[PDB]
Amino acid sequence: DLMDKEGKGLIEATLDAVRMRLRPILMTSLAFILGVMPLVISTGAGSGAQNAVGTGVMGGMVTATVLAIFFVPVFFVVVRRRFSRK
Amino acid sequence: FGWFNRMFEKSTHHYTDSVGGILRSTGRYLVLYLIIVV
Amino acid sequence: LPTGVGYDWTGSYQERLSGNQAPSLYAISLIVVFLCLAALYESWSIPFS
Amino acid sequence: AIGLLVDDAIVVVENVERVMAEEGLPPKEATRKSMGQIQGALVGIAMVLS
Amino acid sequence: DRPIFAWVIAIIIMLAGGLAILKLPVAQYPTIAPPAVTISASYP
């Protein structure tokens, strides 16, 4: 949105963008992991199916934000994918 | 409270400067991405 | 085995579970996701991110 | 779902929360030109979630 | 108007329709005659 209507920001739009929205990612994703929390442990006999569900998303959401707000793609991408050539 | 003052620091320094710090490089965290896939 | 002795399954998928199934399901989940990410985007780069 | 539900609830609300501070602005019209930035996704994300 | 969004609509039809040819009877003429049952005994 910034790259178009506003200004280019070759890398200073991608940067300026998470400068204004690290809030909602680490606010939902935290809220999500805590809502899944009662299934992963806590309940341990009423339905062990709760364990099967929450274990494979608590695990993934740790590695879906502490990574995707960071280090590996979701910034790096737009750079080499959109820019770098055409 | 701290709380706000805290979050505002991380978000700014700490994070955003360390994002322009990694954005500077590229091929190290690309070879990391593929190491992740393996 | 000896003559006049064949076999037949029962009844043992007939089509089930992780694929067979899965791949073809995911396959289309990949062939679509790219579109949608273009029906509101345009380029040849945005959706790869 | 409960997770992928408050997620869509959270973004529309807190993107007002910046636009009422980033350019200090309570009113209705803040809400309006925030879904300028927000909704471009919303329908698109719904198309790929599906 | 705009290219992409329209082309994406046409690519649904590249599937869907092509998916239908791998999923809908390839047979001759469709049931025409009004359908009938037949009793049949035998007194040898």
PDB file of C-alpha atoms in Angstrom:
ATOM      1  CA  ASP A   1       0.000   0.000   0.000  1.00  0.00           C
ATOM      2  CA  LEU A   2       2.896   2.284   0.939  1.00  0.00           C
ATOM      3  CA  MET A   3       4.909   1.218  -2.134  1.00  0.00           C
ATOM      4  CA  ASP A   4       2.084   2.492  -4.367  1.00  0.00           C
ATOM      5  CA  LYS A   5      -0.254   5.292  -3.106  1.00  0.00           C
ATOM      6  CA  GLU A   6       2.430   6.663  -0.728  1.00  0.00           C
ATOM      7  CA  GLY A   7       6.168   6.304  -1.562  1.00  0.00           C
ATOM      8  CA  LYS A   8       8.496   3.614  -2.936  1.00  0.00           C
ATOM      9  CA  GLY A   9      10.427   2.592   0.174  1.00  0.00           C
ATOM     10  CA  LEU A  10      12.673   0.162  -1.719  1.00  0.00           C
ATOM     11  CA  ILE A  11      13.403  -1.344   1.698  1.00  0.00           C
ATOM     12  CA  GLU A  12      12.050   1.596   3.766  1.00  0.00           C
ATOM     13  CA  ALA A  13       8.397   0.629   3.189  1.00  0.00           C
ATOM     14  CA  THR A  14       8.724  -3.028   4.230  1.00  0.00           C
ATOM     15  CA  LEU A  15      10.575  -1.731   7.305  1.00  0.00           C
ATOM     16  CA  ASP A  16       8.154   1.163   7.889  1.00  0.00           C
ATOM     17  CA  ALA A  17       5.264  -1.324   7.633  1.00  0.00           C
ATOM     18  CA  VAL A  18       6.176  -3.525  10.625  1.00  0.00           C
ATOM     19  CA  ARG A  19       7.235  -0.320  12.344  1.00  0.00           C
ATOM     20  CA  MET A  20       3.420  -0.024  12.466  1.00  0.00           C
ATOM     21  CA  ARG A  21       1.911  -3.539  12.973  1.00  0.00           C
ATOM     22  CA  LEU A  22       4.077  -5.850  15.134  1.00  0.00           C
ATOM     23  CA  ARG A  23       1.235  -5.173  17.613  1.00  0.00           C
ATOM     24  CA  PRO A  24      -1.597  -7.242  15.979  1.00  0.00           C
ATOM     25  CA  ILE A  25       0.610 -10.252  15.114  1.00  0.00           C
ATOM     26  CA  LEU A  26       2.000 -10.739  18.639  1.00  0.00           C
ATOM     27  CA  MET A  27      -1.442  -9.922  20.124  1.00  0.00           C
ATOM     28  CA  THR A  28      -3.533 -12.427  18.165  1.00  0.00           C
ATOM     29  CA  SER A  29      -0.822 -15.120  17.997  1.00  0.00           C
ATOM     30  CA  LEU A  30      -0.362 -14.828  21.774  1.00  0.00           C
ATOM     31  CA  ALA A  31      -4.152 -14.917  22.279  1.00  0.00           C
ATOM     32  CA  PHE A  32      -4.267 -17.961  19.958  1.00  0.00           C
ATOM     33  CA  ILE A  33      -1.606 -19.997  21.769  1.00  0.00           C
ATOM     34  CA  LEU A  34      -3.352 -19.348  25.110  1.00  0.00           C
ATOM     35  CA  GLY A  35      -6.774 -20.403  23.778  1.00  0.00           C
ATOM     36  CA  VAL A  36      -5.196 -23.611  22.452  1.00  0.00           C
ATOM     37  CA  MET A  37      -3.368 -24.056  25.804  1.00  0.00           C
ATOM     38  CA  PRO A  38      -6.197 -25.902  27.675  1.00  0.00           C
ATOM     39  CA  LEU A  39      -6.164 -28.644  24.975  1.00  0.00           C
ATOM     40  CA  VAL A  40      -2.415 -29.300  24.802  1.00  0.00           C
ATOM     41  CA  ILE A  41      -2.107 -30.176  28.489  1.00  0.00           C
ATOM     42  CA  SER A  42      -4.577 -29.387  31.354  1.00  0.00           C
ATOM     43  CA  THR A  43      -7.246 -31.793  30.019  1.00  0.00           C
ATOM     44  CA  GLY A  44      -5.803 -35.319  30.087  1.00  0.00           C
ATOM     45  CA  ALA A  45      -8.542 -37.989  29.972  1.00  0.00           C
ATOM     46  CA  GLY A  46     -11.970 -36.469  29.202  1.00  0.00           C
ATOM     47  CA  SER A  47     -10.881 -36.300  25.580  1.00  0.00           C
ATOM     48  CA  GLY A  48      -7.288 -37.081  24.589  1.00  0.00           C
ATOM     49  CA  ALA A  49      -8.211 -35.797  21.118  1.00  0.00           C
ATOM     50  CA  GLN A  50      -7.738 -32.275  22.526  1.00  0.00           C
ATOM     51  CA  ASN A  51      -4.043 -33.180  22.923  1.00  0.00           C
ATOM     52  CA  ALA A  52      -3.774 -34.271  19.269  1.00  0.00           C
ATOM     53  CA  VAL A  53      -5.118 -30.919  18.003  1.00  0.00           C
ATOM     54  CA  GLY A  54      -3.430 -28.293  20.182  1.00  0.00           C
ATOM     55  CA  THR A  55       0.030 -29.907  20.140  1.00  0.00           C
ATOM     56  CA  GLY A  56       0.278 -29.391  16.361  1.00  0.00           C
ATOM     57  CA  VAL A  57      -0.582 -25.660  16.404  1.00  0.00           C
ATOM     58  CA  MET A  58       0.953 -24.421  19.667  1.00  0.00           C
ATOM     59  CA  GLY A  59       4.120 -25.918  18.182  1.00  0.00           C
ATOM     60  CA  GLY A  60       3.533 -24.285  14.804  1.00  0.00           C
ATOM     61  CA  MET A  61       2.455 -20.854  16.110  1.00  0.00           C
ATOM     62  CA  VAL A  62       5.676 -20.544  18.093  1.00  0.00           C
ATOM     63  CA  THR A  63       7.375 -21.061  14.710  1.00  0.00           C
ATOM     64  CA  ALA A  64       4.776 -19.014  12.743  1.00  0.00           C
ATOM     65  CA  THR A  65       5.521 -15.642  14.398  1.00  0.00           C
ATOM     66  CA  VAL A  66       8.952 -16.024  16.051  1.00  0.00           C
ATOM     67  CA  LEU A  67      10.317 -16.451  12.507  1.00  0.00           C
ATOM     68  CA  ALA A  68       7.673 -14.871  10.241  1.00  0.00           C
ATOM     69  CA  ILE A  69       8.066 -11.489  11.987  1.00  0.00           C
ATOM     70  CA  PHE A  70      11.780 -12.027  11.705  1.00  0.00           C
ATOM     71  CA  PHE A  71      14.837 -13.945  10.435  1.00  0.00           C
ATOM     72  CA  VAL A  72      13.228 -16.010   7.681  1.00  0.00           C
ATOM     73  CA  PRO A  73      10.826 -14.686   5.017  1.00  0.00           C
ATOM     74  CA  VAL A  74       8.004 -12.112   5.452  1.00  0.00           C
ATOM     75  CA  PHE A  75      10.400  -9.212   4.665  1.00  0.00           C
ATOM     76  CA  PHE A  76      13.256 -11.041   3.001  1.00  0.00           C
ATOM     77  CA  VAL A  77      10.631 -12.374   0.563  1.00  0.00           C
ATOM     78  CA  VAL A  78       9.044  -9.183  -0.861  1.00  0.00           C
ATOM     79  CA  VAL A  79      12.633  -7.912  -1.268  1.00  0.00           C
ATOM     80  CA  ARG A  80      14.073 -10.690  -3.509  1.00  0.00           C
ATOM     81  CA  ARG A  81      10.684 -11.677  -5.027  1.00  0.00           C
ATOM     82  CA  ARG A  82       9.140  -8.307  -5.976  1.00  0.00           C
ATOM     83  CA  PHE A  83      12.350  -6.244  -6.283  1.00  0.00           C
ATOM     84  CA  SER A  84      15.767  -7.758  -7.375  1.00  0.00           C
ATOM     85  CA  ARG A  85      14.784  -7.657 -11.117  1.00  0.00           C
ATOM     86  CA  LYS A  86      11.273  -6.768 -12.426  1.00  0.00           C
TER      87      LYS A  86
ATOM     88  CA  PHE B   1       3.331   1.332  33.781  1.00  0.00           C
ATOM     89  CA  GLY B   2       6.521  -0.242  32.424  1.00  0.00           C
ATOM     90  CA  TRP B   3       4.526  -2.469  30.129  1.00  0.00           C
ATOM     91  CA  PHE B   4       3.999   0.225  27.440  1.00  0.00           C
ATOM     92  CA  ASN B   5       7.473   1.790  27.777  1.00  0.00           C
ATOM     93  CA  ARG B   6       8.837  -1.771  27.516  1.00  0.00           C
ATOM     94  CA  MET B   7       6.933  -2.847  24.365  1.00  0.00           C
ATOM     95  CA  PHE B   8       7.680   0.480  22.628  1.00  0.00           C
ATOM     96  CA  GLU B   9      11.423  -0.081  23.159  1.00  0.00           C
ATOM     97  CA  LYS B  10      11.583  -3.669  21.790  1.00  0.00           C
ATOM     98  CA  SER B  11       9.389  -2.729  18.805  1.00  0.00           C
ATOM     99  CA  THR B  12      11.687   0.199  17.935  1.00  0.00           C
ATOM    100  CA  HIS B  13      15.312  -0.816  18.627  1.00  0.00           C
ATOM    101  CA  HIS B  14      15.852  -4.069  19.360  1.00  0.00           C
ATOM    102  CA  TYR B  15      13.436  -5.183  16.677  1.00  0.00           C
ATOM    103  CA  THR B  16      13.086  -2.686  13.778  1.00  0.00           C
ATOM    104  CA  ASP B  17      16.809  -1.764  13.625  1.00  0.00           C
ATOM    105  CA  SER B  18      17.646  -5.491  13.825  1.00  0.00           C
ATOM    106  CA  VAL B  19      15.268  -5.970  10.844  1.00  0.00           C
ATOM    107  CA  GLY B  20      17.124  -3.406   8.738  1.00  0.00           C
ATOM    108  CA  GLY B  21      20.204  -5.194  10.076  1.00  0.00           C
ATOM    109  CA  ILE B  22      19.129  -8.545   8.617  1.00  0.00           C
ATOM    110  CA  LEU B  23      17.487  -6.981   5.502  1.00  0.00           C
ATOM    111  CA  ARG B  24      20.994  -5.608   4.821  1.00  0.00           C
ATOM    112  CA  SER B  25      22.244  -9.188   4.494  1.00  0.00           C
ATOM    113  CA  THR B  26      20.172 -11.739   2.549  1.00  0.00           C
ATOM    114  CA  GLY B  27      22.077 -14.811   1.355  1.00  0.00           C
ATOM    115  CA  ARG B  28      22.845 -15.976   4.913  1.00  0.00           C
ATOM    116  CA  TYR B  29      19.166 -16.084   5.937  1.00  0.00           C
ATOM    117  CA  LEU B  30      18.264 -17.593   2.535  1.00  0.00           C
ATOM    118  CA  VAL B  31      20.684 -20.479   3.100  1.00  0.00           C
ATOM    119  CA  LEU B  32      18.999 -20.647   6.531  1.00  0.00           C
ATOM    120  CA  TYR B  33      15.515 -20.844   4.951  1.00  0.00           C
ATOM    121  CA  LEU B  34      16.564 -23.848   2.849  1.00  0.00           C
ATOM    122  CA  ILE B  35      18.257 -25.440   5.879  1.00  0.00           C
ATOM    123  CA  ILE B  36      14.798 -25.142   7.485  1.00  0.00           C
ATOM    124  CA  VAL B  37      13.129 -26.978   4.573  1.00  0.00           C
ATOM    125  CA  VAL B  38      15.651 -29.865   4.551  1.00  0.00           C
TER     126      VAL B  38
ATOM    127  CA  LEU C   1       0.516 -70.669  -4.499  1.00  0.00           C
ATOM    128  CA  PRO C   2      -1.174 -73.700  -6.170  1.00  0.00           C
ATOM    129  CA  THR C   3      -3.576 -73.627  -9.135  1.00  0.00           C
ATOM    130  CA  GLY C   4      -7.172 -72.478  -8.660  1.00  0.00           C
ATOM    131  CA  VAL C   5      -6.328 -70.220  -5.711  1.00  0.00           C
ATOM    132  CA  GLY C   6      -6.570 -66.435  -6.119  1.00  0.00           C
ATOM    133  CA  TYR C   7      -7.178 -63.480  -3.799  1.00  0.00           C
ATOM    134  CA  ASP C   8      -9.233 -60.337  -3.085  1.00  0.00           C
ATOM    135  CA  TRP C   9      -9.214 -57.598  -0.417  1.00  0.00           C
ATOM    136  CA  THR C  10     -11.764 -56.897   2.348  1.00  0.00           C
ATOM    137  CA  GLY C  11     -13.122 -54.772   3.936  1.00  0.00           C
ATOM    138  CA  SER C  12      -9.171 -52.290   3.807  1.00  0.00           C
ATOM    139  CA  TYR C  13      -9.362 -48.738   2.500  1.00  0.00           C
ATOM    140  CA  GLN C  14     -10.810 -48.743  -1.073  1.00  0.00           C
ATOM    141  CA  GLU C  15      -9.678 -45.064  -0.788  1.00  0.00           C
ATOM    142  CA  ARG C  16      -8.681 -43.452   2.552  1.00  0.00           C
ATOM    143  CA  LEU C  17      -6.331 -41.738   5.009  1.00  0.00           C
ATOM    144  CA  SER C  18      -3.118 -39.849   4.311  1.00  0.00           C
ATOM    145  CA  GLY C  19      -2.750 -40.177   0.579  1.00  0.00           C
ATOM    146  CA  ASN C  20      -3.059 -41.278  -2.144  1.00  0.00           C
ATOM    147  CA  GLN C  21      -5.703 -38.784  -0.816  1.00  0.00           C
ATOM    148  CA  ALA C  22      -3.721 -36.003   0.960  1.00  0.00           C
ATOM    149  CA  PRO C  23      -1.263 -34.891  -1.794  1.00  0.00           C
ATOM    150  CA  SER C  24      -4.082 -34.364  -4.374  1.00  0.00           C
ATOM    151  CA  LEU C  25      -6.011 -32.366  -1.735  1.00  0.00           C
ATOM    152  CA  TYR C  26      -2.967 -30.195  -0.878  1.00  0.00           C
ATOM    153  CA  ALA C  27      -2.063 -30.000  -4.586  1.00  0.00           C
ATOM    154  CA  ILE C  28      -5.260 -28.029  -5.326  1.00  0.00           C
ATOM    155  CA  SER C  29      -4.860 -26.100  -2.049  1.00  0.00           C
ATOM    156  CA  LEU C  30      -1.613 -24.858  -3.669  1.00  0.00           C
ATOM    157  CA  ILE C  31      -3.030 -24.329  -7.187  1.00  0.00           C
ATOM    158  CA  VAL C  32      -5.769 -22.080  -5.734  1.00  0.00           C
ATOM    159  CA  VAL C  33      -3.990 -20.164  -2.904  1.00  0.00           C
ATOM    160  CA  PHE C  34      -1.830 -18.443  -5.584  1.00  0.00           C
ATOM    161  CA  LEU C  35      -4.933 -17.122  -7.435  1.00  0.00           C
ATOM    162  CA  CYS C  36      -6.914 -15.401  -4.688  1.00  0.00           C
ATOM    163  CA  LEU C  37      -3.439 -13.958  -3.919  1.00  0.00           C
ATOM    164  CA  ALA C  38      -3.660 -12.109  -7.275  1.00  0.00           C
ATOM    165  CA  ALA C  39      -7.420 -11.513  -7.405  1.00  0.00           C
ATOM    166  CA  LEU C  40      -6.603  -8.725  -4.901  1.00  0.00           C
ATOM    167  CA  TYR C  41      -2.877  -8.144  -5.629  1.00  0.00           C
ATOM    168  CA  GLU C  42      -1.439  -8.346  -9.200  1.00  0.00           C
ATOM    169  CA  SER C  43       2.260  -9.072 -10.048  1.00  0.00           C
ATOM    170  CA  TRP C  44       4.355 -12.261 -10.203  1.00  0.00           C
ATOM    171  CA  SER C  45       6.038 -11.938  -6.803  1.00  0.00           C
ATOM    172  CA  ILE C  46       3.477 -11.020  -4.115  1.00  0.00           C
ATOM    173  CA  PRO C  47       1.991 -14.541  -3.877  1.00  0.00           C
ATOM    174  CA  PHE C  48       5.385 -16.285  -3.650  1.00  0.00           C
ATOM    175  CA  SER C  49       6.072 -14.344  -0.427  1.00  0.00           C
TER     176      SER C  49
ATOM    177  CA  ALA D   1     -11.793 -21.714  14.746  1.00  0.00           C
ATOM    178  CA  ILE D   2     -11.851 -19.689  17.988  1.00  0.00           C
ATOM    179  CA  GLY D   3      -8.276 -18.755  17.112  1.00  0.00           C
ATOM    180  CA  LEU D   4      -8.937 -17.956  13.432  1.00  0.00           C
ATOM    181  CA  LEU D   5     -11.853 -15.697  14.407  1.00  0.00           C
ATOM    182  CA  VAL D   6     -10.560 -13.244  17.038  1.00  0.00           C
ATOM    183  CA  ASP D   7      -7.621 -12.822  14.643  1.00  0.00           C
ATOM    184  CA  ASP D   8      -9.976 -11.220  12.108  1.00  0.00           C
ATOM    185  CA  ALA D   9     -11.619  -9.348  15.001  1.00  0.00           C
ATOM    186  CA  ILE D  10      -8.301  -8.012  16.335  1.00  0.00           C
ATOM    187  CA  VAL D  11      -6.859  -6.356  13.212  1.00  0.00           C
ATOM    188  CA  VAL D  12      -9.824  -4.091  12.400  1.00  0.00           C
ATOM    189  CA  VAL D  13      -9.963  -2.892  16.049  1.00  0.00           C
ATOM    190  CA  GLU D  14      -6.274  -2.247  16.759  1.00  0.00           C
ATOM    191  CA  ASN D  15      -5.560  -0.685  13.350  1.00  0.00           C
ATOM    192  CA  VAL D  16      -8.015   1.976  14.511  1.00  0.00           C
ATOM    193  CA  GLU D  17      -6.003   2.091  17.761  1.00  0.00           C
ATOM    194  CA  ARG D  18      -2.904   3.246  15.845  1.00  0.00           C
ATOM    195  CA  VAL D  19      -4.838   5.594  13.529  1.00  0.00           C
ATOM    196  CA  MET D  20      -6.205   7.210  16.729  1.00  0.00           C
ATOM    197  CA  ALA D  21      -2.629   8.077  17.822  1.00  0.00           C
ATOM    198  CA  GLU D  22      -0.372   7.862  14.757  1.00  0.00           C
ATOM    199  CA  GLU D  23      -2.557  10.839  13.770  1.00  0.00           C
ATOM    200  CA  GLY D  24      -4.469  11.332  17.064  1.00  0.00           C
ATOM    201  CA  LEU D  25      -8.038  10.869  15.850  1.00  0.00           C
ATOM    202  CA  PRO D  26     -10.949   9.231  17.766  1.00  0.00           C
ATOM    203  CA  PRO D  27     -13.858   9.825  15.341  1.00  0.00           C
ATOM    204  CA  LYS D  28     -15.890   7.766  12.849  1.00  0.00           C
ATOM    205  CA  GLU D  29     -13.731   8.857   9.888  1.00  0.00           C
ATOM    206  CA  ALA D  30     -10.636   7.266  11.456  1.00  0.00           C
ATOM    207  CA  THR D  31     -12.458   3.907  11.303  1.00  0.00           C
ATOM    208  CA  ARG D  32     -13.278   4.588   7.624  1.00  0.00           C
ATOM    209  CA  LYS D  33      -9.812   5.269   6.172  1.00  0.00           C
ATOM    210  CA  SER D  34      -8.326   2.422   8.236  1.00  0.00           C
ATOM    211  CA  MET D  35     -10.274  -0.191   6.221  1.00  0.00           C
ATOM    212  CA  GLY D  36      -8.549   1.577   3.339  1.00  0.00           C
ATOM    213  CA  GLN D  37      -5.429  -0.118   4.722  1.00  0.00           C
ATOM    214  CA  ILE D  38      -7.187  -3.151   6.306  1.00  0.00           C
ATOM    215  CA  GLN D  39      -9.902  -4.440   3.954  1.00  0.00           C
ATOM    216  CA  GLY D  40      -7.702  -4.817   0.863  1.00  0.00           C
ATOM    217  CA  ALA D  41      -6.559  -7.912   2.747  1.00  0.00           C
ATOM    218  CA  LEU D  42      -9.800  -9.085   4.521  1.00  0.00           C
ATOM    219  CA  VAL D  43     -11.546 -10.406   1.359  1.00  0.00           C
ATOM    220  CA  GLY D  44      -8.246 -11.592  -0.152  1.00  0.00           C
ATOM    221  CA  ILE D  45      -7.248 -13.460   3.040  1.00  0.00           C
ATOM    222  CA  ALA D  46     -10.749 -15.003   3.069  1.00  0.00           C
ATOM    223  CA  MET D  47     -10.191 -16.232  -0.498  1.00  0.00           C
ATOM    224  CA  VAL D  48      -6.937 -18.049   0.457  1.00  0.00           C
ATOM    225  CA  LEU D  49      -8.008 -19.291   3.885  1.00  0.00           C
ATOM    226  CA  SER D  50     -10.687 -20.997   1.763  1.00  0.00           C
TER     227      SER D  50
ATOM    228  CA  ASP E   1     -10.637  -3.201 -17.032  1.00  0.00           C
ATOM    229  CA  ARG E   2      -7.867  -5.032 -15.102  1.00  0.00           C
ATOM    230  CA  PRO E   3      -6.158  -8.227 -16.373  1.00  0.00           C
ATOM    231  CA  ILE E   4      -5.151 -10.530 -13.439  1.00  0.00           C
ATOM    232  CA  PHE E   5      -8.431 -10.544 -11.426  1.00  0.00           C
ATOM    233  CA  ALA E   6     -10.287 -11.577 -14.602  1.00  0.00           C
ATOM    234  CA  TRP E   7      -7.684 -14.197 -15.654  1.00  0.00           C
ATOM    235  CA  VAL E   8      -7.930 -15.742 -12.172  1.00  0.00           C
ATOM    236  CA  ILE E   9     -11.691 -16.149 -12.767  1.00  0.00           C
ATOM    237  CA  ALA E  10     -10.967 -17.941 -16.068  1.00  0.00           C
ATOM    238  CA  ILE E  11      -8.442 -20.274 -14.372  1.00  0.00           C
ATOM    239  CA  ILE E  12     -11.139 -21.545 -11.990  1.00  0.00           C
ATOM    240  CA  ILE E  13     -12.844 -22.644 -15.210  1.00  0.00           C
ATOM    241  CA  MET E  14      -9.600 -24.260 -16.467  1.00  0.00           C
ATOM    242  CA  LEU E  15     -10.066 -26.502 -13.431  1.00  0.00           C
ATOM    243  CA  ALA E  16     -13.716 -27.139 -12.329  1.00  0.00           C
ATOM    244  CA  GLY E  17     -14.786 -27.822 -15.940  1.00  0.00           C
ATOM    245  CA  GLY E  18     -11.701 -29.961 -16.575  1.00  0.00           C
ATOM    246  CA  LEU E  19     -12.234 -31.576 -13.164  1.00  0.00           C
ATOM    247  CA  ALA E  20     -15.794 -32.369 -14.300  1.00  0.00           C
ATOM    248  CA  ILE E  21     -14.577 -34.291 -17.381  1.00  0.00           C
ATOM    249  CA  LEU E  22     -12.600 -36.566 -15.007  1.00  0.00           C
ATOM    250  CA  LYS E  23     -15.738 -37.004 -12.829  1.00  0.00           C
ATOM    251  CA  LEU E  24     -19.001 -37.051 -14.873  1.00  0.00           C
ATOM    252  CA  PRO E  25     -20.304 -40.007 -16.953  1.00  0.00           C
ATOM    253  CA  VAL E  26     -18.766 -40.367 -20.447  1.00  0.00           C
ATOM    254  CA  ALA E  27     -21.647 -42.561 -21.674  1.00  0.00           C
ATOM    255  CA  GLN E  28     -24.055 -42.483 -24.655  1.00  0.00           C
ATOM    256  CA  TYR E  29     -27.534 -40.876 -24.841  1.00  0.00           C
ATOM    257  CA  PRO E  30     -29.047 -40.178 -21.386  1.00  0.00           C
ATOM    258  CA  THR E  31     -32.076 -42.078 -20.006  1.00  0.00           C
ATOM    259  CA  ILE E  32     -34.778 -41.344 -22.622  1.00  0.00           C
ATOM    260  CA  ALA E  33     -37.409 -44.075 -22.361  1.00  0.00           C
ATOM    261  CA  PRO E  34     -39.790 -43.882 -19.381  1.00  0.00           C
ATOM    262  CA  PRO E  35     -38.477 -46.608 -17.075  1.00  0.00           C
ATOM    263  CA  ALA E  36     -40.172 -49.996 -16.600  1.00  0.00           C
ATOM    264  CA  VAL E  37     -39.983 -53.104 -14.397  1.00  0.00           C
ATOM    265  CA  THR E  38     -40.479 -56.694 -15.621  1.00  0.00           C
ATOM    266  CA  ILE E  39     -41.970 -59.671 -13.764  1.00  0.00           C
ATOM    267  CA  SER E  40     -40.905 -63.086 -15.126  1.00  0.00           C
ATOM    268  CA  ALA E  41     -41.954 -66.570 -13.947  1.00  0.00           C
ATOM    269  CA  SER E  42     -41.580 -70.061 -15.449  1.00  0.00           C
ATOM    270  CA  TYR E  43     -43.867 -73.117 -15.337  1.00  0.00           C
ATOM    271  CA  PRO E  44     -41.667 -75.808 -16.981  1.00  0.00           C
TER     272      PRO E  44
END
